[PDB]
Amino acid sequence: ASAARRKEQELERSQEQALREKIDSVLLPILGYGNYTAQVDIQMDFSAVEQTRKRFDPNTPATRSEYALEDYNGSVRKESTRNFELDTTISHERKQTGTVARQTVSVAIKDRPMSESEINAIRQVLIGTVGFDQGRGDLLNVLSVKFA
Amino acid sequence: ASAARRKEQELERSQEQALREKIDSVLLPILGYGNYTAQVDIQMDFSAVEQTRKRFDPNTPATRSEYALEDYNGSVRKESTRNFELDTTISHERKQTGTVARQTVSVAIKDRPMSESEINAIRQVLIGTVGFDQGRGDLLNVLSVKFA
């Protein structure tokens, strides 16, 4: 199984490399060659979830058989027996093993600095270039630093 | 199964490449060569959902057999027994494995900037060029940036 773990590491590294390639394909025309640096971290879960759900519909029952005895005298006896049929959904789901659980991307732009408007524009391009998903916990940093 | 995961990555990359090709086929005449850059992120779910639904119709029962005893004297006894037949739908669905769960497209247009009207027109063309589906969570960014 350790060979499987090794190949999982290979998958994660391949994903990171592909994302880096896309980042380059976007930023190389916009910024130029050597005016930026970017690295990508991709964390992938490899669990084996397998779920079975059996759901009913309480608010729409359908009476199948029914008995109702109601006699008076004073005495009032109200017996009743009822059998129901209910909407039944049975869903069996099997999640894919390797899923990107969190994605971190950081891009540093060489100074000569960059204005806030262009930094936010680059961030907007990257959002969509990488597939930024904040609800997944992903993080995207864009900074303007001084290259040596 | 890790080979299957590798081929799933290949499928996702192929989808992204096809969408990029369509984007180019639309924008190359309109904008020109080298006046734009665009990248596409496609996230695909590969679950194995398999659902079985059994639904009834509570509001239209059909009486199959019926017994009704109603005697008086004062004393009033009202016995009743009833059997019903109901509309029964049984649907077994099996979803396709790989489905595009979210799609992100970002396009950056070289300045010399672009007016808001033409930016929105390009966005309208892309909506339909790519098959934008906001209800799916898809995202489409169109920006006017300064190429270096």
């Binding site: 199948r64 058989s65 008995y67 027996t81 009822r82 059998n83 129901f84 | 027994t81």
Partner: peptide, 12 residues
């Protein structure tokens, strides 16, 4: 009565 119900108990 119809014990048809997979959980029919009323029976009677």
């Amino acid at each position: 009565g119809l014990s048809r119900t997979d959980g029919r108990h009323i029976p009677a």
